[model samples]
Target: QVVASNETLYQVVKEVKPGGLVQIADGTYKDVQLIVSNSGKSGLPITIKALNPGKVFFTGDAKVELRGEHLILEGIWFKDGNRAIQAWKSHGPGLVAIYGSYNRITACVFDCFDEANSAYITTSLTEDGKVPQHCRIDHCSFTDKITFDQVINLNNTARAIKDGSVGGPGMYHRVDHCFFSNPQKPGNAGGGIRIGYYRNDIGRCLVDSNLFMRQDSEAEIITSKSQENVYYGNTYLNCQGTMNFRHGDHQVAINNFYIGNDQRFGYGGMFVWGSRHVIACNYFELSETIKSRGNAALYLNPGAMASEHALAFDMLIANNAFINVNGYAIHFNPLDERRKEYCAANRLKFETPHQLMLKGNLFFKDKPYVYPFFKDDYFIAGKNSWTGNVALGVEKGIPVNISANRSAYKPVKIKDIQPIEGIALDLNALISKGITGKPLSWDEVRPYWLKEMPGTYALTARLSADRAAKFKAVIKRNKEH
Candidate 1:
């Protein structure tokens, strides 16, 4: 059925059949909530589309819930909604929620639909604790968000376990070619995209080909709180944070590009804190140090918790390009005693991160080292190994030996393993250019609905001192809204 301006969306969706199509008319929908509970079949999925892509808009407290399989939603614009303390206690439904398998959301725009601290878009589980799989979110634009949670989350909290490792292949959810440019928020409550949050949270979930432009929202950009996930071919363009392995183990960061251009941030590239993970074929160009902090290119830290809260152990950093960068090529264990005390109050024990490998990498520059690698205090001794690494005008720091095997230093044996389904899992394989890794272009990632290309924002600035009184004046204006 063709939904007219006066017709509600639920009425038309109820009658849609397998392989059928429903078109929403070119007009504005006001204060509507979409809760779809139907299914279509494989190769015969149902489609719900806007009659005119950019012309159809949903405004004023719009929320969506997709609870059926094989569903596709396309080219709908969402704008100007405000949900208050009644955002159902901040665990409310998302502006867009996916609760079914094999679903796709594409060519959509979510612009400033500010709500109370809820994730803007989520692939969440059902009420009965059933986790969905093989979902895709691609070619979408999420801009000007003012909320205080993950902008996009692949949630797997229903599967969290306290005893024994709940091992798995993964949920296999994928997010690609999307744009996330949120205004920087405060505290540790919000970030750009996150996978699972628990120790049992595991996924082969892929974050690929996305453009994150100056997202200074939190200390982390792509927060992988889960395990076995892969972040590949994504571009972090001067975003004032890092792609964090905040938790979890056996994850991979490959073929990603970081363009810092001598800029500083709240944090820096590839914030490391996991075990047995592989970071390879990445490129860091024209980077800057976080002054009073560590390297802007790569930072590996000691955590306050043994659950890999912020530790990096037995990990592999290989074959990456570090061009015209500043600070240590790899910054290790920049301890914050304040953070250690804070974690202790939570009953979490801080452990030192150790046993990492840096192999077959090119660290290039034309000037002298701001911090020499051979004896830089930024790196702790007896915690790491270096092999097959080359430097053009920079210094090379080896882990076990600087005296012998200059081309292939094998210090006290850093661990390496993993070969599934006929895939080559070797040191040489890790050094090759990652599959499909390239610098992303605007036309390749931006959706068709945007009239022009989106640009990067200036580095985040600090809010001035009216402080809590700042909230007083802002919330006073907010109360009127």
Candidate 2:
């Protein structure tokens, strides 16, 4: 069905059939509230798209709410607004909100929005334990200026906690190839993507290949607060803040590239605050040093005590390359201001041993000598076992313990492991030619953030020149298949 104006859009979408198309005509739609509360079967899903690609503009308090299943939103351009639409305003804020399962929002652009405490898109849980599952947000560009908060907020908190188990929904939601460029905000908590918070279980969510740049807010580019979330092959360009794991378990950060220029924040590159996280196969080059006493290229902090507050246990740091990281390459210890207060209140030990494994990583310094390879200012008592790691042309200032046993476990040039699953893209190419138009080419898109194209395209550039030979070998192996 066709919709020419906002007056007829709501009713037309209400009456749209299961395998139908609700195409919006090329025009500026004002204050249009599109609420979809119907479901479509497999292979016959409903589609809502713009008739003329980016021509249809949604301005002034426009919103899209998906309350059912198998709905697809494509090529709709949202110019600006307060809140796009929300699954539930009582739950949280979202411009394009989803309470339904199995939906897709692709190739859309949301630009220049002035709002207070609003996200461009979000997902919430249902009363029946039905979380939005198997949903995909792909190839969308979000450039927004806001008073507070994130561009994409995925808060999948469990409605209720059952018998030592988290009982909510929201899993396996994939966000890929999206561009998030948020200008500096005066407020403290603003950034690109925030996945899960407070009774939320953000397990198995794949945040891959997205580009985050120039986010000057205090919050990290991606503030992950849930468990088992994978951030793979993403690039952070000039992003001043960290890619922080505020609270969660079993998180994975692999094959990410952080190129920082005069950027500073709580933790420089990656900040870990939860348990059982794996940081592997990434490259970091930050000009600014982490100012905090115990912070570094990879800093681990502790959060408030709760079910979310498990021991910062079993952390695996492997196969990473740090270049010109002004601070320590691995700062493995907890920096918590409330530690003394908490210990006094609960009558607990001030320091406790943490379980950690550091293996097969590389550290290099272009013009460093400021800090050491490992800094253990963590007042809390913890232990880390290290093996198969090497550092070159870098100054080891203070003689910090390289291992837990205090006998000194030295790093060596060992066999390298594959960190991320996809090819790394050229940061220079991405900065130059960013999302010009429709039908984007392979070079225009980043790797692991989207599906691979069939035809041959340009070669992806590795962030580290030292890894060029190995990257070439990997590319050669990839091309054979």
**Best-matching candidate per lDDT:** 1
Per-model clash counts, in order, read: 1, 4
TM-score for each candidate, following the candidate numbering = 0.84, 0.76
Instruction: Please list the C-alpha lDDT of all candidates, in the order they appear.
Output: 0.69, 0.63
Candidate 2, 310-367: lDDT as tens digits: 3355677776777777678766554555654565576654543256776756677768
Off by over 4 Å in 2: 82-91, 127-129, 158-167, 186-190, 198-202, 262-267, 292-295, 302-311, 342-353, 378-382, 397-443, 446-481
Number of the predicted model whose TM-score against the real structure is largest: 1
- Span of ten consecutive residues with least summed lDDT in model 2: 454-463
For candidate 1, write residues 1-481 as lDDT tens digits.
Answer: 5786535678878878889898898988877777777898999998998978887887776778889999999988887565554543333446788998889999988765655557778888788878878888999987666566778888776534443566333678889999877666655746788887755567778787898876666777888887877777788777767888877877888778877664455335777777888888888764565554465577776666436355567888877777666666666665546446756877777655668777767666665547543323345676677677666554555443433233442222223446322122343354463333556766788778777643223223333242323324433543446
Q: After aligning candidate 2 to the native by TM-score, how far in Å is the CA of 292 from where it should be?
A: 5.0
Deviation of model 2 at 109, angstroms:
1.4
Error of 1 at 106 (Å): 0.5
